[PDB]
């Protein structure tokens, strides 16, 4: 079902401060190694009048490398798949909710994303495109309400120095109740590997792996 | 442009905890008197697996009665119109973002809404449909970032007694720059006037008027 | 117990961004008319390195005028009195928690307050003293867990224009379970009537009255 | 100044939901190895009417083991020392702010803590004492405003199962500006190693170490 190498296609429909847009992409990676890349294209509403960085994390948790003793809830959910939703609370008031469906079709993962971002200050980092990528991050996960949940304290690097803080709250829901893991963590590092002048064509790379707390 | 009697058409595309649905409706009211009603039909995704109440407020401020000394930002925005976005933070973790466009076509207001609700507990008031309508409310508004903003501490009455709290944060954005008001308030009371057994056909009534603080 | 005219004494022990201070005051008013004034003096920690405005609201609801049909929980709590606590969430990260005890000693109300404020940006309106008093406000109250709770969307006027937003969450706890009101509101307007340059000596006036929603 | 072995004494003055209490203790540890213990005694307000767990993390970061390439801001602040403040946002509404001062005297660290906790549901995990200790955690830190800040997504284990979520927001302020680290993490695991029936006497052990993200 989930091969050593897997490709995926994604489509996002979103709005940010009243500006609607569409994005289509194709990616690939090694689900058991914790690596995956993706190439995106703004197919509608481009060039985007905000930082591409807020969208990069919405474009693969099935590719998270999991140790044998931590049930890989997301991988187990296939072939049916899972859905995930998320809240992004930015420190200057901006708020985003995301809903996504992940399925398996013709040997390829299919991602469907709906994005709504609101309340971003007009002179803030997002609308002024002053961000420079995310710092590597660490997610705290745990089972609840029959599904998997996780929170992350993330940060975008600012062009003029400093950080722009964003709290991530995600909900991973398998389409069939498969084995859930316990309290654990997932380290991720997402890099923008290429981009044209106006970010209408972008490529990303993500390394992500789950683990127990260094149990210090 | 804004007659004493105006009708409107509305369509909402939304998702709540991974459940997709569509709703279309028709309303009418008296913009200078602060009254307006609307009849809705769940055109897709019905019956809804959640409380209808969280949707009722996404279904009119151009109909808010305003004193002569308080600029009616929304009315002034027409014929072009305005967009409004919103964040609803529920006390039990549920979060929703909404983005809407309000326009005027041949004497009839046109509303287009996109709604995304996430993180609602499966045993909570919303997913268990234990709500019984909203209490009348009072929104605190003010100008900022060249637009109009307002927050509200609202509450849903619970069938088993008590209230279910929700904080509202809205942004009203005219499509063309117009006169903004100062720090003021808007009282509203929304009632569900009719509904079939599964809430696939619902009618609503809302009275809403703006005013200065009772200037105590 | 509660006469048409009542005086009170207050003492606050507080800390803000690592700065310790103490304040003592004396006030008076007409509990049944909704008016009361208070005079403060910074006895330790002066001059304060932050805006006085964040402290003014911690210095009386027993003086809130209530309609005969709305139980005046706070007045009913005496002679024993009541305790109140509160959270103030500032839009720029600043957070404050307050705990207070109100008693009646020799026909005089006695207020004991503890205050801890943290996370205020050193460049923010608070630490830079860029505020000019609060806008009149409106609190939303309701009963819960045997006590009375209330929330407010308040705002401080900024010297250079605009507002600085702060959300209030209060908990009023009678020392003995006395009668509680239903869902209602309380309007208030606090004004600094006098003060020296460094706010080591200040006088305040507050008008506050309870009521049902104007019911729109 | 900071030897391989160091003792400390601490005193806490706090209040929770109107209940006041005072705690005194003494601990010891190995600053460069990341190990430290502490023994507490509720000297006033005991037996506490709430879960001891919310207080345990308020009782040593100068004992965090740091790699040579990461400036140990907190150790460098001595002999004068540093102050730290914090906000703990509990998922059911509870909110706590803490302010603390850390100094070095006659070769012994001296800790003074003030604590105010409010808005805990009378039937919640805290007031019902339904918690069973913290899960090991991971704090995300970064420099800002000349000081060191960090956030943590923590969880308290529940007796009836599941977790009780709490977000930590801390600010570490050296009394003199000493070198700051960059974006990094601190792992910690605090265990209650001893306690009498009513938690009026308690002992704790904490292992905490700083490090760069596993830099995936």
Tab-separated table of N, CA and C in Angstrom, chain C residues 68-200:
chain	number	residue	atom	x	y	z
C	68	UNK	N	-33.928	46.713	40.659
C	68	UNK	CA	-34.539	45.850	41.661
C	68	UNK	C	-34.718	44.401	41.205
C	69	UNK	N	-34.948	44.194	39.914
C	69	UNK	CA	-35.175	42.846	39.413
C	69	UNK	C	-33.926	42.023	39.113
C	70	UNK	N	-32.750	42.606	39.317
C	70	UNK	CA	-31.499	41.886	39.085
C	70	UNK	C	-30.778	41.739	40.424
C	71	UNK	N	-30.672	40.506	40.941
C	71	UNK	CA	-29.986	40.333	42.225
C	71	UNK	C	-28.573	40.904	42.258
C	72	UNK	N	-28.328	41.749	43.253
C	72	UNK	CA	-27.041	42.400	43.434
C	72	UNK	C	-26.144	41.492	44.289
C	73	UNK	N	-25.689	40.401	43.676
C	73	UNK	CA	-24.827	39.395	44.295
C	73	UNK	C	-23.730	39.961	45.207
C	74	UNK	N	-23.000	40.964	44.728
C	74	UNK	CA	-21.919	41.544	45.520
C	74	UNK	C	-22.396	42.241	46.790
C	75	UNK	N	-23.503	42.970	46.708
C	75	UNK	CA	-24.018	43.629	47.902
C	75	UNK	C	-24.552	42.578	48.872
C	76	UNK	N	-25.251	41.584	48.334
C	76	UNK	CA	-25.826	40.522	49.150
C	76	UNK	C	-24.760	39.715	49.890
C	77	UNK	N	-23.518	39.785	49.419
C	77	UNK	CA	-22.418	39.034	50.024
C	77	UNK	C	-21.949	39.559	51.377
C	78	UNK	N	-22.234	40.820	51.675
C	78	UNK	CA	-21.807	41.380	52.951
C	78	UNK	C	-22.805	41.026	54.051
C	79	UNK	N	-22.439	41.246	55.326
C	79	UNK	CA	-21.180	41.801	55.833
C	79	UNK	C	-19.896	40.996	55.633
C	80	UNK	N	-19.999	39.684	55.431
C	80	UNK	CA	-18.792	38.879	55.244
C	80	UNK	C	-17.983	39.411	54.063
C	81	UNK	N	-18.655	39.627	52.940
C	81	UNK	CA	-17.964	40.159	51.783
C	81	UNK	C	-17.748	39.144	50.685
C	82	UNK	N	-16.842	39.465	49.773
C	82	UNK	CA	-16.568	38.577	48.660
C	82	UNK	C	-15.139	38.753	48.185
C	83	UNK	N	-14.690	37.826	47.351
C	83	UNK	CA	-13.350	37.897	46.789
C	83	UNK	C	-13.537	37.949	45.278
C	84	UNK	N	-12.632	38.618	44.579
C	84	UNK	CA	-12.714	38.618	43.130
C	84	UNK	C	-11.334	38.366	42.542
C	85	UNK	N	-11.308	37.760	41.363
C	85	UNK	CA	-10.055	37.470	40.689
C	85	UNK	C	-10.253	37.842	39.233
C	86	UNK	N	-9.161	38.003	38.503
C	86	UNK	CA	-9.298	38.438	37.131
C	86	UNK	C	-8.049	38.197	36.300
C	87	UNK	N	-8.264	38.059	34.998
C	87	UNK	CA	-7.192	37.876	34.037
C	87	UNK	C	-7.357	39.010	33.039
C	88	UNK	N	-6.257	39.669	32.695
C	88	UNK	CA	-6.286	40.718	31.687
C	88	UNK	C	-5.312	40.256	30.608
C	89	UNK	N	-5.828	39.980	29.414
C	89	UNK	CA	-4.980	39.543	28.306
C	89	UNK	C	-4.794	40.719	27.352
C	90	UNK	N	-3.586	41.280	27.311
C	90	UNK	CA	-3.310	42.417	26.434
C	90	UNK	C	-2.968	41.925	25.033
C	91	UNK	N	-3.367	42.678	24.012
C	91	UNK	CA	-3.119	42.249	22.644
C	91	UNK	C	-1.658	42.080	22.258
C	92	UNK	N	-0.732	42.673	23.009
C	92	UNK	CA	0.675	42.517	22.657
C	92	UNK	C	1.417	41.491	23.519
C	93	UNK	N	0.668	40.585	24.143
C	93	UNK	CA	1.292	39.551	24.950
C	93	UNK	C	1.247	39.750	26.452
C	94	UNK	N	1.103	40.995	26.895
C	94	UNK	CA	1.038	41.253	28.321
C	94	UNK	C	-0.098	40.483	28.974
C	95	UNK	N	0.184	39.884	30.128
C	95	UNK	CA	-0.823	39.127	30.862
C	95	UNK	C	-0.739	39.454	32.348
C	96	UNK	N	-1.898	39.657	32.959
C	96	UNK	CA	-1.979	39.974	34.379
C	96	UNK	C	-3.066	39.158	35.056
C	97	UNK	N	-2.799	38.716	36.284
C	97	UNK	CA	-3.801	38.017	37.072
C	97	UNK	C	-3.895	38.813	38.361
C	98	UNK	N	-5.111	38.923	38.878
C	98	UNK	CA	-5.356	39.678	40.093
C	98	UNK	C	-6.209	38.847	41.040
C	99	UNK	N	-5.981	39.001	42.337
C	99	UNK	CA	-6.794	38.305	43.323
C	99	UNK	C	-7.055	39.351	44.392
C	100	UNK	N	-8.297	39.429	44.856
C	100	UNK	CA	-8.669	40.454	45.825
C	100	UNK	C	-9.675	39.953	46.844
C	101	UNK	N	-9.663	40.581	48.014
C	101	UNK	CA	-10.590	40.233	49.074
C	101	UNK	C	-11.266	41.510	49.551
C	102	UNK	N	-12.592	41.475	49.631
C	102	UNK	CA	-13.356	42.631	50.077
C	102	UNK	C	-14.124	42.277	51.342
C	103	UNK	N	-13.867	43.028	52.404
C	103	UNK	CA	-14.534	42.798	53.675
C	103	UNK	C	-15.155	44.094	54.178
C	104	UNK	N	-15.842	44.010	55.311
C	104	UNK	CA	-16.475	45.173	55.914
C	104	UNK	C	-15.981	45.280	57.348
C	105	UNK	N	-15.199	46.316	57.630
C	105	UNK	CA	-14.659	46.520	58.967
C	105	UNK	C	-15.048	47.893	59.505
C	106	UNK	N	-15.813	47.888	60.593
C	106	UNK	CA	-16.281	49.113	61.237
C	106	UNK	C	-16.986	50.067	60.279
C	107	UNK	N	-17.951	49.539	59.533
C	107	UNK	CA	-18.709	50.353	58.597
C	107	UNK	C	-17.920	50.856	57.404
C	108	UNK	N	-16.735	50.293	57.196
C	108	UNK	CA	-15.877	50.690	56.083
C	108	UNK	C	-15.422	49.464	55.287
C	109	UNK	N	-15.519	49.539	53.961
C	109	UNK	CA	-15.100	48.430	53.107
C	109	UNK	C	-13.581	48.361	53.114
C	110	UNK	N	-13.044	47.149	53.187
C	110	UNK	CA	-11.603	46.958	53.192
C	110	UNK	C	-11.205	46.112	51.980
C	111	UNK	N	-10.334	46.654	51.132
C	111	UNK	CA	-9.883	45.954	49.926
C	111	UNK	C	-8.409	45.568	50.016
C	112	UNK	N	-8.112	44.292	49.782
C	112	UNK	CA	-6.737	43.784	49.796
C	112	UNK	C	-6.498	43.207	48.400
C	113	UNK	N	-5.533	43.754	47.667
C	113	UNK	CA	-5.284	43.292	46.299
C	113	UNK	C	-3.862	42.814	46.014
C	114	UNK	N	-3.756	41.710	45.277
C	114	UNK	CA	-2.464	41.167	44.870
C	114	UNK	C	-2.496	41.193	43.347
C	115	UNK	N	-1.409	41.669	42.751
C	115	UNK	CA	-1.328	41.879	41.307
C	115	UNK	C	0.001	41.399	40.728
C	116	UNK	N	-0.057	40.612	39.654
C	116	UNK	CA	1.150	40.135	38.974
C	116	UNK	C	0.969	40.338	37.473
C	117	UNK	N	1.803	41.193	36.893
C	117	UNK	CA	1.735	41.460	35.469
C	117	UNK	C	3.029	41.022	34.818
C	118	UNK	N	2.929	40.258	33.735
C	118	UNK	CA	4.121	39.770	33.056
C	118	UNK	C	4.028	39.841	31.532
C	119	UNK	N	5.175	39.658	30.883
C	119	UNK	CA	5.291	39.637	29.427
C	119	UNK	C	4.947	40.913	28.663
C	120	UNK	N	5.106	42.074	29.295
C	120	UNK	CA	4.837	43.332	28.608
C	120	UNK	C	6.091	43.729	27.827
C	121	UNK	N	5.963	43.942	26.506
C	121	UNK	CA	7.115	44.332	25.682
C	121	UNK	C	7.720	45.613	26.244
C	122	UNK	N	9.042	45.651	26.385
C	122	UNK	CA	9.704	46.833	26.940
C	122	UNK	C	9.460	48.070	26.085
C	123	UNK	N	9.072	47.842	24.838
C	123	UNK	CA	8.805	48.904	23.882
C	123	UNK	C	7.305	49.149	23.741
C	124	UNK	N	6.509	48.363	24.457
C	124	UNK	CA	5.063	48.496	24.379
C	124	UNK	C	4.480	49.727	25.053
C	125	UNK	N	3.178	49.989	24.853
C	125	UNK	CA	2.469	51.138	25.433
C	125	UNK	C	2.529	51.164	26.956
C	126	UNK	N	2.574	49.985	27.566
C	126	UNK	CA	2.602	49.895	29.019
C	126	UNK	C	3.922	50.334	29.640
C	127	UNK	N	5.020	49.736	29.196
C	127	UNK	CA	6.329	50.081	29.740
C	127	UNK	C	6.836	51.434	29.261
C	128	UNK	N	6.253	51.933	28.177
C	128	UNK	CA	6.645	53.219	27.615
C	128	UNK	C	5.686	54.330	28.060
C	129	UNK	N	4.631	53.944	28.774
C	129	UNK	CA	3.624	54.879	29.273
C	129	UNK	C	3.024	55.716	28.144
C	130	UNK	N	2.454	55.049	27.145
C	130	UNK	CA	1.853	55.740	26.005
C	130	UNK	C	0.321	55.734	26.060
C	131	UNK	N	-0.248	55.402	27.216
C	131	UNK	CA	-1.702	55.339	27.341
C	131	UNK	C	-2.334	56.578	27.963
C	132	UNK	N	-3.611	56.789	27.651
C	132	UNK	CA	-4.358	57.944	28.140
C	132	UNK	C	-5.737	57.614	28.693
C	133	UNK	N	-5.855	56.573	29.506
C	133	UNK	CA	-7.158	56.250	30.061
C	133	UNK	C	-7.983	55.267	29.251
C	134	UNK	N	-8.977	54.675	29.905
C	134	UNK	CA	-9.839	53.692	29.265
C	134	UNK	C	-11.060	54.306	28.614
C	135	UNK	N	-11.591	53.603	27.621
C	135	UNK	CA	-12.817	54.013	26.958
C	135	UNK	C	-13.863	53.468	27.924
C	136	UNK	N	-15.087	53.982	27.862
C	136	UNK	CA	-16.158	53.472	28.715
C	136	UNK	C	-16.349	52.038	28.233
C	137	UNK	N	-16.771	51.141	29.119
C	137	UNK	CA	-16.898	49.742	28.726
C	137	UNK	C	-18.209	49.062	29.089
C	138	UNK	N	-18.364	47.832	28.611
C	138	UNK	CA	-19.565	47.045	28.887
C	138	UNK	C	-19.205	45.587	29.141
C	139	UNK	N	-19.435	45.148	30.377
C	139	UNK	CA	-19.140	43.785	30.818
C	139	UNK	C	-20.331	42.848	30.617
C	140	UNK	N	-20.040	41.623	30.192
C	140	UNK	CA	-21.064	40.608	29.969
C	140	UNK	C	-20.939	39.631	31.135
C	141	UNK	N	-21.975	39.547	31.966
C	141	UNK	CA	-21.947	38.656	33.121
C	141	UNK	C	-22.932	37.494	33.055
C	142	UNK	N	-22.634	36.451	33.820
C	142	UNK	CA	-23.475	35.266	33.884
C	142	UNK	C	-23.067	34.424	35.081
C	143	UNK	N	-23.991	33.591	35.578
C	143	UNK	CA	-23.692	32.727	36.720
C	143	UNK	C	-23.025	31.433	36.247
C	144	UNK	N	-22.165	30.865	37.086
C	144	UNK	CA	-21.490	29.605	36.767
C	144	UNK	C	-20.722	29.071	37.970
C	145	UNK	N	-20.809	27.762	38.192
C	145	UNK	CA	-20.128	27.113	39.315
C	145	UNK	C	-20.435	27.796	40.647
C	146	UNK	N	-21.672	28.257	40.807
C	146	UNK	CA	-22.059	28.907	42.046
C	146	UNK	C	-21.578	30.336	42.242
C	147	UNK	N	-20.815	30.873	41.297
C	147	UNK	CA	-20.330	32.246	41.434
C	147	UNK	C	-20.759	33.102	40.243
C	148	UNK	N	-20.321	34.358	40.220
C	148	UNK	CA	-20.660	35.270	39.128
C	148	UNK	C	-19.414	35.568	38.288
C	149	UNK	N	-19.527	35.385	36.976
C	149	UNK	CA	-18.411	35.639	36.074
C	149	UNK	C	-18.752	36.730	35.058
C	150	UNK	N	-17.727	37.409	34.551
C	150	UNK	CA	-17.965	38.463	33.581
C	150	UNK	C	-16.763	38.711	32.687
C	151	UNK	N	-17.008	39.077	31.435
C	151	UNK	CA	-15.915	39.364	30.504
C	151	UNK	C	-16.131	40.732	29.864
C	152	UNK	N	-15.040	41.392	29.495
C	152	UNK	CA	-15.127	42.709	28.875
C	152	UNK	C	-14.073	42.902	27.792
C	153	UNK	N	-14.455	43.555	26.698
C	153	UNK	CA	-13.492	43.879	25.656
C	153	UNK	C	-13.232	45.359	25.908
C	154	UNK	N	-12.123	45.651	26.579
C	154	UNK	CA	-11.778	47.027	26.915
C	154	UNK	C	-10.683	47.614	26.035
C	155	UNK	N	-10.448	48.914	26.180
C	155	UNK	CA	-9.446	49.581	25.361
C	155	UNK	C	-8.863	50.825	26.003
C	156	UNK	N	-7.543	50.942	25.914
C	156	UNK	CA	-6.824	52.090	26.435
C	156	UNK	C	-6.521	53.013	25.262
C	157	UNK	N	-6.749	54.307	25.453
C	157	UNK	CA	-6.472	55.289	24.409
C	157	UNK	C	-4.964	55.498	24.380
C	158	UNK	N	-4.392	55.595	23.186
C	158	UNK	CA	-2.957	55.801	23.069
C	158	UNK	C	-2.629	57.262	22.790
C	159	UNK	N	-1.589	57.759	23.455
C	159	UNK	CA	-1.139	59.138	23.301
C	159	UNK	C	-1.098	59.547	21.837
C	160	UNK	N	-0.367	58.775	21.043
C	160	UNK	CA	-0.200	59.063	19.627
C	160	UNK	C	-1.347	58.597	18.738
C	161	UNK	N	-2.501	58.347	19.345
C	161	UNK	CA	-3.652	57.922	18.572
C	161	UNK	C	-3.866	56.423	18.527
C	162	UNK	N	-5.121	56.025	18.349
C	162	UNK	CA	-5.446	54.616	18.286
C	162	UNK	C	-5.736	54.042	19.656
C	163	UNK	N	-6.007	52.743	19.696
C	163	UNK	CA	-6.304	52.060	20.946
C	163	UNK	C	-5.360	50.894	21.191
C	164	UNK	N	-5.309	50.470	22.448
C	164	UNK	CA	-4.496	49.346	22.899
C	164	UNK	C	-5.529	48.425	23.552
C	165	UNK	N	-5.809	47.307	22.891
C	165	UNK	CA	-6.830	46.364	23.331
C	165	UNK	C	-6.482	45.389	24.452
C	166	UNK	N	-7.419	45.238	25.386
C	166	UNK	CA	-7.241	44.354	26.536
C	166	UNK	C	-8.543	43.636	26.851
C	167	UNK	N	-8.479	42.320	27.020
C	167	UNK	CA	-9.668	41.545	27.353
C	167	UNK	C	-9.698	41.250	28.843
C	168	UNK	N	-10.838	41.514	29.481
C	168	UNK	CA	-11.011	41.265	30.915
C	168	UNK	C	-11.854	40.018	31.194
C	169	UNK	N	-11.391	39.179	32.117
C	169	UNK	CA	-12.125	37.981	32.524
C	169	UNK	C	-12.101	38.020	34.043
C	170	UNK	N	-13.259	38.246	34.656
C	170	UNK	CA	-13.332	38.339	36.106
C	170	UNK	C	-14.200	37.260	36.738
C	171	UNK	N	-13.897	36.953	37.992
C	171	UNK	CA	-14.639	35.959	38.750
C	171	UNK	C	-14.975	36.579	40.102
C	172	UNK	N	-16.261	36.776	40.370
C	172	UNK	CA	-16.686	37.356	41.638
C	172	UNK	C	-17.211	36.229	42.514
C	173	UNK	N	-16.563	36.032	43.657
C	173	UNK	CA	-16.911	34.941	44.561
C	173	UNK	C	-17.349	35.365	45.958
C	174	UNK	N	-18.650	35.271	46.223
C	174	UNK	CA	-19.174	35.629	47.536
C	174	UNK	C	-18.621	34.608	48.522
C	175	UNK	N	-18.262	35.060	49.719
C	175	UNK	CA	-17.714	34.167	50.731
C	175	UNK	C	-18.755	33.159	51.204
C	176	UNK	N	-20.016	33.443	50.894
C	176	UNK	CA	-21.127	32.556	51.217
C	176	UNK	C	-22.009	32.589	49.972
C	177	UNK	N	-22.544	31.433	49.556
C	177	UNK	CA	-23.397	31.365	48.365
C	177	UNK	C	-24.693	32.170	48.437
C	178	UNK	N	-24.642	33.409	47.961
C	178	UNK	CA	-25.816	34.267	47.958
C	178	UNK	C	-26.444	34.233	46.572
C	179	UNK	N	-27.634	34.811	46.447
C	179	UNK	CA	-28.359	34.814	45.182
C	179	UNK	C	-27.612	35.403	43.993
C	180	UNK	N	-27.706	34.699	42.868
C	180	UNK	CA	-27.040	35.086	41.632
C	180	UNK	C	-28.021	35.625	40.605
C	181	UNK	N	-27.566	36.566	39.766
C	181	UNK	CA	-28.422	37.141	38.733
C	181	UNK	C	-28.326	36.216	37.530
C	182	UNK	N	-29.004	36.578	36.449
C	182	UNK	CA	-28.947	35.771	35.245
C	182	UNK	C	-27.936	36.390	34.298
C	183	UNK	N	-28.177	36.269	32.999
C	183	UNK	CA	-27.285	36.833	31.987
C	183	UNK	C	-27.547	38.334	31.920
C	184	UNK	N	-26.541	39.148	32.217
C	184	UNK	CA	-26.747	40.590	32.149
C	184	UNK	C	-25.471	41.373	31.870
C	185	UNK	N	-25.582	42.698	31.868
C	185	UNK	CA	-24.438	43.558	31.587
C	185	UNK	C	-24.222	44.658	32.612
C	186	UNK	N	-23.001	45.177	32.640
C	186	UNK	CA	-22.638	46.273	33.526
C	186	UNK	C	-21.811	47.297	32.759
C	187	UNK	N	-22.331	48.515	32.663
C	187	UNK	CA	-21.617	49.583	31.975
C	187	UNK	C	-20.744	50.288	32.997
C	188	UNK	N	-19.577	50.752	32.564
C	188	UNK	CA	-18.669	51.445	33.467
C	188	UNK	C	-17.822	52.460	32.721
C	189	UNK	N	-17.486	53.547	33.400
C	189	UNK	CA	-16.632	54.566	32.817
C	189	UNK	C	-15.714	55.040	33.924
C	190	UNK	N	-14.437	54.707	33.802
C	190	UNK	CA	-13.466	55.104	34.806
C	190	UNK	C	-12.625	56.241	34.260
C	191	UNK	N	-12.517	57.310	35.045
C	191	UNK	CA	-11.735	58.477	34.651
C	191	UNK	C	-10.716	58.807	35.719
C	192	UNK	N	-9.529	59.199	35.280
C	192	UNK	CA	-8.497	59.625	36.205
C	192	UNK	C	-8.812	61.112	36.353
C	193	UNK	N	-9.241	61.526	37.539
C	193	UNK	CA	-9.596	62.923	37.762
C	193	UNK	C	-8.430	63.808	38.202
C	194	UNK	N	-7.374	63.197	38.724
C	194	UNK	CA	-6.217	63.963	39.174
C	194	UNK	C	-4.997	63.067	39.312
C	195	UNK	N	-3.811	63.636	39.103
C	195	UNK	CA	-2.576	62.872	39.221
C	195	UNK	C	-1.348	63.761	39.080
C	196	UNK	N	-0.260	63.409	39.759
C	196	UNK	CA	0.959	64.184	39.592
C	196	UNK	C	1.653	63.595	38.366
C	197	UNK	N	2.749	64.207	37.934
C	197	UNK	CA	3.452	63.749	36.741
C	197	UNK	C	3.863	62.276	36.706
C	198	UNK	N	4.358	61.745	37.822
C	198	UNK	CA	4.809	60.356	37.833
C	198	UNK	C	3.827	59.332	38.389
C	199	UNK	N	2.583	59.747	38.580
C	199	UNK	CA	1.532	58.872	39.092
C	199	UNK	C	1.813	58.181	40.426
C	200	UNK	N	2.449	58.904	41.345
C	200	UNK	CA	2.716	58.375	42.675
C	200	UNK	C	1.526	58.812	43.543
